[PDB]
């Protein structure tokens, strides 16, 4: 069982053109309710979204908290900013998803044999800092920029046990699936 399933739902990443992106859910948001179902863990949101879709619910309420950073002078005593939203329940039978991802850092958990990843020499346990000069925090950010790199060389910066190495790669199409891939496994 994955570890994030018990942690609170703090949005680490939102996919574009998804239900969550179009509705305005941003990274750092914390989902606390949907219809109903109280949401304290990622497991709750997953099970609630499955039952809602199977029950035929197409629209429902989604309560969300948006906080962080240093308080503004005079506004330190303000109550938490809660957001009442009307979400479009993703059709779980058709494979739809809400479009939000947890906060897991891009630490590699495995490298495929012969795949263009040992090509340059990236090892498991490596922490992917940034990609192409783009500061990232989650693994889904790096997968975003493999398929829109359109075969061009991508530059990545990796921290290994203390030292920060720089490694580039260029792999693209594949005959089996038909998409771009690099050859890295999340932990």
């Amino acid at each position, epitope marked *: 069982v994955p570890k994030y399933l018990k942690e609170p739902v703090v949005v680490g990443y939102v996919q574009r053109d998804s239900i969550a992106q179009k509705i*305005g859910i941003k990274p750092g948001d914390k989902i606390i309710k949907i219809n109903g179902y109280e949401v304290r863990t990622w497991e709750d949101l997953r099970d609630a979204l499955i039952r809602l879709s199977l029950d035929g619910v197409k629209e429902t309420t989604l309560f969300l908290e948006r906080e962080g950073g*240093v308080a*503004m*002078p*005079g*506004a330190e*005593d*303000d*109550v938490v*900013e809660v957001l009442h939203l009307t979400i479009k329940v993703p059709n779980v039978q058709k494979g739809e998803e809400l479009g939000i991802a947890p906060l897991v850092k891009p630490v590699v958990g495995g490298v495929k044999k012969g795949s263009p990843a040992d090509q340059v020499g990236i090892k498991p346990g490596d922490l992917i800092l940034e990609v192409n000069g783009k500061k990232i925090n989650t693994w889904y950010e790096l997968v975003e920029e493999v398929r829109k790199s359109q075969g061009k060389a991508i530059k990545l910066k990796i921290l290994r046990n203390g030292k920060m190495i720089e490694k580039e790669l260029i792999p693209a199409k594949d005959p089996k699936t038909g998409t771009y891939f690099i050859g890295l496994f999340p932990k």
Partner: antibody
Framework: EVQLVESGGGLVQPGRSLKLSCAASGFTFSNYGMAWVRQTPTKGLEWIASISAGGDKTYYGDSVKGRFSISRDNAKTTHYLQMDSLRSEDTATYYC??????????WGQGVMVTVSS | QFVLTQPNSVSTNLGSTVKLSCKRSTGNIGSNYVNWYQQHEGRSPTTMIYRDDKRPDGVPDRFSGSIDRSSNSALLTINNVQTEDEADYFCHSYSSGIVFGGGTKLTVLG
């Protein structure tokens, strides 16, 4: 909807006092801090005062030298701005504003204050 | 503590893309949130962008804010600039006190 409407402006002779009001409605007043931001065509938006949600803490801008006193009455959902020792350089449009942790989420309509003899 | 410097005026054409800059004098841009306010002629300011890039309900998606800690400058971007976008724009931040920018009068021609 959140509504903030100012009142208590007008004209004052240089050196006398005025008390601005800001009636709030459409939200839990005591849950949020209020503030006052004035505007001149020469300087633009300038922060003046700010009071915490409970009314315990107060923060003042640089242009006020202990002259202005911001308070609030959570029973009537209204906060006030006492303005003593007014000079001609205080002639501006005065907005009250509601805060949401890190910014002003809603502004009032603004009230004009003219300091002249 | 610090000030925010905006271009006093920026002229762009209808349908183009304007980038309104807000440079922080001293201190790191990311240590405090940057908020953008639109003020039409003779009207009260409304919120266009809060918490660096969050857009309130009602504001068109043509508006988007961003943070650039390299230049310590915040940018308010307006795609497909309309006639109703012609107004004043004040960036805003805070620390020990509360700081406003000088304001940028966005003129739009065409």
């Amino acid at each position: 909807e959140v509504q903030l409407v100012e009142s208590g402006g007008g004209l004052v002779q240089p050196g006398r006092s005025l008390k601005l009001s800001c009636a709030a409605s459409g939200f839990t007043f005591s849950n949020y801090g209020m503030a006052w931001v004035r505007q001149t065509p020469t300087k633009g938006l300038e922060w003046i005062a700010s009071i915490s949600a409970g009314g315990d803490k107060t923060y003042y801008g640089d242009s006020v030298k202990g002259r202005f006193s911001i308070s609030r009455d959570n029973a009537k959902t209204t906060h006030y701005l006492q303005m003593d020792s007014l000079r001609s350089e205080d002639t501006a449009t005065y907005y009250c504003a509601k805060t949401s942790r890190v910014y002003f989420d809603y502004w009032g309509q603004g009230v004009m204050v003219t300091v002249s003899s | 503590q610090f000030v925010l410097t905006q271009p006093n005026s920026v002229s762009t054409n209808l349908g183009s893309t304007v980038k309104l800059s807000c440079k922080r004098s001293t201190g790191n841009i990311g240590s405090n949130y940057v908020n953008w306010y639109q003020q039409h002629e003779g009207r009260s300011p409304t919120t266009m962008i809060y918490r660096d890039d969050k857009r309130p309900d009602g504001v068109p998606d043509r508006f988007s804010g961003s943070i650039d800690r390299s230049s310590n400058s915040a940018l308010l971007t307006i795609n497909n600039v309309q006639t109703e976008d012609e107004a004043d724009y004040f960036c805003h931040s805070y620390s020990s006190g509360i700081v406003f920018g000088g304001g940028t009068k966005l003129t739009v021609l065409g």
